[PDB]
Amino acid sequence: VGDYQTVATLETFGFLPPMTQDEIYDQIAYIIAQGWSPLIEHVHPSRSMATYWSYWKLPFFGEKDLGVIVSELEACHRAYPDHHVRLVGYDAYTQSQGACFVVFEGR
Amino acid sequence: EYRDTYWTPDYVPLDTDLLACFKCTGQEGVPKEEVAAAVAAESSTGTWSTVWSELLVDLDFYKGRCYRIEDVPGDKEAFYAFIAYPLDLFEEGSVTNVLTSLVGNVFGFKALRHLRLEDIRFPMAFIKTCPGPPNGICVERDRMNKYGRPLLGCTIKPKLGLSGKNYGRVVYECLRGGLDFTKDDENINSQPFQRWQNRFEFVAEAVALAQQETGEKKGHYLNCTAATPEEMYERAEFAKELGQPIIMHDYITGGFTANTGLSKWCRKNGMLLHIHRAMHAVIDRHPKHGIHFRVLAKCLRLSGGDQLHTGTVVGKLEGDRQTTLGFIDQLRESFIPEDRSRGNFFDQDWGSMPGVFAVASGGIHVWHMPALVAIFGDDSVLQFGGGTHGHPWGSAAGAAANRVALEACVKARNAGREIEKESRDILMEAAKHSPELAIALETWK
Amino acid sequence: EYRDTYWTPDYVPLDTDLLACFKCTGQEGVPKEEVAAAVAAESSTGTWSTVWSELLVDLDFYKGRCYRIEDVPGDKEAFYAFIAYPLDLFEEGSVTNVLTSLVGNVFGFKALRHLRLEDIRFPMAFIKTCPGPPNGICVERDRMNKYGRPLLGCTIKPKLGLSGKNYGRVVYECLRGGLDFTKDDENINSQPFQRWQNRFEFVAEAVALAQQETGEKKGHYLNCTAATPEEMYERAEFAKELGQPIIMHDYITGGFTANTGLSKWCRKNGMLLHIHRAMHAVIDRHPKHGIHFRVLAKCLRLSGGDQLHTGTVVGKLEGDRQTTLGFIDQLRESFIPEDRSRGNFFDQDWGSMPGVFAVASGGIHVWHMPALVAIFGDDSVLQFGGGTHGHPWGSAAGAAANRVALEACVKARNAGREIEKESRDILMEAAKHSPELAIALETWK
Amino acid sequence: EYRDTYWTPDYVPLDTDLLACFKCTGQEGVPKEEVAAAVAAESSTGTWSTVWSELLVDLDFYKGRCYRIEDVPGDKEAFYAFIAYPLDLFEEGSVTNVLTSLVGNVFGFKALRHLRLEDIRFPMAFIKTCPGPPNGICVERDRMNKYGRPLLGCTIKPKLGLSGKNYGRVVYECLRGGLDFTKDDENINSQPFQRWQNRFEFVAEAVALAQQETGEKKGHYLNCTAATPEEMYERAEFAKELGQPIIMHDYITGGFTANTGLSKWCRKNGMLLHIHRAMHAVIDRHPKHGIHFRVLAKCLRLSGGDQLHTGTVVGKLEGDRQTTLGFIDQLRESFIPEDRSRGNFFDQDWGSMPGVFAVASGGIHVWHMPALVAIFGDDSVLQFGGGTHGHPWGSAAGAAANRVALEACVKARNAGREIEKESRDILMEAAKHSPELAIALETWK
Amino acid sequence: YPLDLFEEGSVTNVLTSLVGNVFGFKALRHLRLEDIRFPMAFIKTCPGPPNGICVERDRMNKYGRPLLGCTIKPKLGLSGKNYGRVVYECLRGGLDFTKDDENINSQPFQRWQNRFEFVAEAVALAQQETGEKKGHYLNCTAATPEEMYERAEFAKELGQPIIMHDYITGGFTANTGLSKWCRKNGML
Secondary structure (H helix, E strand, O other), rough: OOOOOOOOEEEEEEEOOOOOOOHHHHHHHHHHHHEEEEEEEEEEEEHHOOOEEEEOOOOOOOOOOOOHHHHHHHHHHHHHOOEEEEEEEEEOOOOOEEEEEEEOOOO | HHHHEEEEEOOOOOOEEEEEEEEEEOOOOOOHHHHHHHHHHHOOOOOOOOOHHHOOOOOOOOOEEEEEEEOOOOOOOOEEEEEEOOHOOOOOOHHHHHHHHHHHHHHHOOHHHHHHHHEOOHHHHHHHHHOOOOOHHHHHHHHHOOOOOEEOOOOOOOOOOHHHHEEEEEHHHHHHOOOOOOOOOOOOEOOOOOOOOHHHHHHHHHHHHHHHOOOOOOOOEOOOOOOOOHHHHHHHHHHHHOOOEEEEEHHHOHHHHHHHHHHHHHHOOOEEEEEOOOOOHHHHHHOOEEEEEHHHHHHHHHOOOEEEEEEOOOOOOOOOHHHHHHHHHHOOOOOOOOOOOOOOOOEOOOOOOOOOOOEEEEOOHHHHHHHHHHHHHOOEEEOHHHHOOOOOOOHHHHHHHHHHHHHHHHHHHHHHOOOOOOOOHHHHHHHOOOOHHHHHHHOOO | OOHHEOOOOOOOOOOOOOOEEEEEEOOOOOOOHHHHHHHHHHHHHOOOOOOOHHHHHOOOOOOOEEEEEEEOOOOOOEEEEEEEHHHHHOOOOOOOOOOOOHHHOOOOOOOOEEEEEEEOOOOOOHHHOOOOOOOHHHHHHHHHHOOOOOOOOOOOOOOOOOOOHHHHHHHHHHOOOOOOOOOHHHOOEEEOOOOHHHHHHHHHHHHHHHHHHHHHOOOOOOEEOOHHHHHHHHEEEEHOOOOOEEEEEEEEHHOOHHHHHHOOOOOOOOOOEEEOOOOOHHHOOOOOEEEEEEHHHHHHHHHHEEEEEOOOOOOOOOOOOHHHHHHHHHHHEEEEEEEOOEEOOOEEEOOOOOOOEEEOOOOOOOOHHHHHHHHOOOOEEEEOOHHHOOOOOOOHHHHHHHHHHHHHHHHHOOHHHHHHHHOHHHHHHHHHOHHHHHHHHHHHH | OOOHEOOOOOOOOOOOEEEEEEEEEEEOOOOOOEEEHHHHHHHOOOOOOOOHHHHHHOOOOOOOEEEEEEEEOOOOEEEEEEEEEOOOHHOOOOHHHHHHHHHOOOOHHOOEEEEEEEEOOOOOHHHHHHHOOOOOHHHHHHHHOOOOOOOEEEEEOOOOOHHHHHHHHHHHHHHHOOOOOOOOOOOOOEEEEEOOOHHHHHHHHHHHHHHHHHHHOOOOOEEEOOOHHHHHHHHHHHHHOOOOOOOEEHHHHHHHHHHHHHHHHHHHOEEEEEEOOOOOHHHHHOOOOOEEEHHHHHHHHHHHOOOOEEEOOOOOOOOOHHHHHHHHHHHHOOOOOOOOOOOOOOOOOOOOOOEEEEEEEOOOOHHHHHHHHHHHHHOEEOOHHHHHHHHOOHHHHHHHHHHHHHHHHHHHHHOOOOOOHHHHHHHHHHHHOHHHHHHHHOOOO | OOOHHHHOOOOHHHHHHHHHHHHHHOOOOOOOOOOOOOHHHHHHHHHOOOHHHHHHHHHOOOOOOOOOOOOOOOOOOOOOHHHHHHHHHHHHOOOOOOOOOOOOOOOOOOOOOHHHHHHHHHHHHHHHOOOOOOOOOEEOOOOOHHHHHHHHHHHHHHOOOOOOOOOHHOOOOHHHHHHHHHHHOOOO
């Protein structure tokens, strides 16, 4: 009974409703606990299929505070409130993205 | 008697040697050292009487050395034997040569009731000689732009009978639900009811359509295992022309030589290689005799490849997941410390040679996923052929339900939670926004 | 329960079906019909619950049928099961597809304690589709101009260590003694101590010299099993350019696909194909589980090839030569009647598709030859690696002694004499003109 | 006398044999058994006196067997003869070899007043050996996404004289009216007034434009029959590069070998193959002598191909549509039961080998369409060269009128109505919304 | 030196005939080659640069100013994606080109195919974004000339307008062959 309509989703937690701020705190705390580094990416939704998004300030290495990460997230969200904004944890020892998901979706 | 020249009581293996572990059971009341030396010789040298030509080449240097006999924990007739091999006894990067030199004739000697190859310690040199996987774990993740979660596949059910259009539309329905990949059936390459060209064309069209619709880089596993290597290369290049980013193969049935050639071609053409373990059980179903699946996994990783089927272990048989996680370690990590419980008898280092994804499929569905995530980590792929297709709402709805279940499970794991116990709460919370997940969890409670 | 749709109490197989025999042992106290139907389904179709896509293709027509359960003579828990397969379930001439569809996943089901593939009845159509052996028995005899007697080979001992010149001169010494062929070692293709090009060049020169000297068309088995199919084809074509009339391969280690491609290339280039059964024991050493060697022999004969290793059975183990002679029948004759003692569970006809030579090697020397001739007939080859080389007078003298022993034995057999009993008199009479034969018979009395 | 060894009074054909039916008329007052045995021998073996070499090969096994002489219903001098053939007398998938072995020399024997090949029962094995049609009926329907109705073609009139631009624009005008395809003329491949490259380029451009405009996947039949196979393959690959989904060929004039090669290339490149029956009448115009068109249709279906010209039978000659529908059955169905009225003398099964579309063209226009739909079913194509072009409103209007006539006819047939009788009412009702259809039906009442 | 002592357009032959054995004579404490005056004929025989200064300026549509490059730091360790994104970040700032490191062609941590693919994608993205014809220097110096030509043709297929090479380590013969291939394929 009923159909599931195709939805333009956003890559690993694109299906779930937008995450709450406490969940963002937990995610960034996990990124810290894994020794990864936070990195902020914003891009226009029309170019979601690109390979590299427009990066914010350089990745924060040795940064272990959640509050600065949240401040940077809200600052970048106010910078481009119409772009898709995601947070990525970078692992230096494996040269991969340990965890990444969208934080703010554009209008 | 062969112990005097093929049993070494105090020899220490060289770091360039090839070390092999055999679980051996000779005849009743035979010297364990003698049967171990017989196995070691039967791997390299064997004569029935005095011989002449062996005095023209130094048999002392070109011979194996069994250097340690250990008592198996559970049988006093079965014993672990560690045999060394000089590096020169093999080809520079030929897993086929390794298998021929290791199990070519040893299994035919009457003086052994049972023989089982357990572990192999490949020297760093031989690993550096082999081509290895064409892409690697991180490179595949980069080429698919998929992270955070394990990937989600499914076998296209039924096993056969589909035409090109029908197979393509079924693959499209499976793919558009957020499923990462789909694998063709291991025994389906080219059939009178379905010629491979039509299947490849239609599945490429469906993959392109689904990729455009869902806004994600997607792909389907295309099989190139066929009668001749020429046909295999032709189908691989046809898939390359159709923009398909991954192809699949059966390395045991097709052959180690064919697998190595396919991996070299994939590296030369920038293609991903999927592999299924068809006929592996015929070599590892018996727990006391044959070749353990860890050896086959090592051989495939050396010969090249990006994915390898394992099951998990769980779903039907709680079993001995320790050794399964052990071969997973040997599949992913660059180095693995010794672990007798995990079936790792050597300190094996792969240098900086990229690992291989693990494939977990068969007898699994939504209910098992938390434990699967816990045991396989993030570097694995999950396939639910019947589960996604047998979902009453359709393959797309089943794939979406499995995708959201995986997302919720990996979120809870990243939250710092013990997923195995509260898994029921996790799936209920996920179902609070996915009715298809709710009905699926209802189907196979 | 799957008996209702996968157990057929009164079905009669169609003459175009593929019939398979499985020696099955389910769990204790389980329905034998149910486990047989589970095996049959697991070969074709398997679902864990109600499914949808199977209603878009007629599962009734594309499904196997187990039609007969017979009680094994010796175990009441083990039972022979005969499963049918519609012709459309396979590829037109792909032994690889047959193996994938037959043992791809059936060995992983938990409801079976043990499973063993016993016999396969290939339909005439599928046999006519496959390329088959490139030359055939009579064609090989024509190309070698050798008749009357079985042919005589030998493995080049030691297993390795020889340079190109040394390997070539050893092969020449073995060949000039009347020996028909020599086979390279199964694990020796290309080594750091010996690159394959030098070995092929020197052995071709030695074969040409011996052919000129002895006045007989001779040849050596050249191995093309390697890391990649490209290297295999390159070495095969290099051997073709050097006028060598036969090459050898390991079909299990190299792969069924590689073997089929090599056989097709040999037919396209007019080359003889030798095959060794390396790693066959890992599939047939266990007498209760795995795949019987007759199935592998059938698969190799379908995939192409001129020679196949068997041992005899005798020399170390008197054993059960009945079933060995049975698979010999399946290797040589165009049709074979059913024989439960010989392990032939089907009336199998090959039409007019040429057979394959049998290879008997390992643990044999001069003393065994009369019985070997009696059991293997005239369509076989005998190899004595250590025996010919370990002869104190040299490889040439040992080869000559074995050659004259074979000549005397086949003469006495043609005389109408029972060779097995009076074999001692036969060998003494032969030694009355060959002192090397006398000393050889003295060595291993 | 040859009856003693080539007439079998009580032989039953084997299921792997090739069975042939000949309508034979020997000289007046000759033994019918003797002349039938003479025909059977002249197909396989013929000697004028005692011979020697036939004792080196078993003539008993490699010989045909005429096993049944039946009285023709209508002539007592003409008789049906059924001759068997062992499977080994032919090549594995060579229709050319079948024709050479069947009619190579039999038609030259003086002892036969007339000889006509009526029916052939191809064994399942030989059918499985041949490549067969590259796509098949359902696969072509999938690739064109056209169902419900038969497809609509037209020959480009006049027979020749058009330049590349003019031919392309005429094809575009025909195609944009809802017409499914257009076929080039059978005798027009490359001319001094028109080089094939220009025609292919312009027709590809026109097909692309019409496909964009009408919103339907369309195509034109491109001819590759030429002087050399190299030119044929070059033109086929040029059409492949230009995105054209179908090419056409004349298999009789070009040759069975050329047709088989073209079909194999189409399968290897994923191309549709159209075929015209040029010069078939020279073989089947005479109703008493020659080869019946059903045999040629069987040969073409075995050799590969997607479409075959038939006429219907109706439009000029009410004739004997029974046998026409019979060969239609042999063209479409996988199995056909025996039907003496339909000219089907054997129980012929094609396994699961896809059939071939039927082509009805020549001497037909709008008025005949209901009967054409009734007799040819939905798996056929209708071509109206002059009718669509000779329509006073233009080729596009004529094609649209024929398209809507076909739509109305298939709608009424699906409605459960007897179309043949009330066809006038059906066409009037269709004309109530298509004035071009009204004027067309007025033109050729 | 008479003109006939050399090959028609072989710098390798010139080096062999000039410094092949002269540096081994004991009667010389030190020897240094300072200047060479190549005759017009020998210059006309050699293939020369495939494009030239003005032709490169035309193919890049860059004038007025010198061009701006940068080596991708660190010297190694980058994966295909990381190397590509670093190159993209360098390129999008108005930088003309980027050069791969001279000792980095194909590594166990980085296979050349992935680097070429990712850097081509990044160059295309940066070219679209900045509105300027851009490119990155791709290295083809490798173990065998076959691999060099294969990588050069792969770069040609990926639309990359320039490749790089080490002529001393790779060899004068390899450099001449690479330049001839670049001229035959229209590559910088």
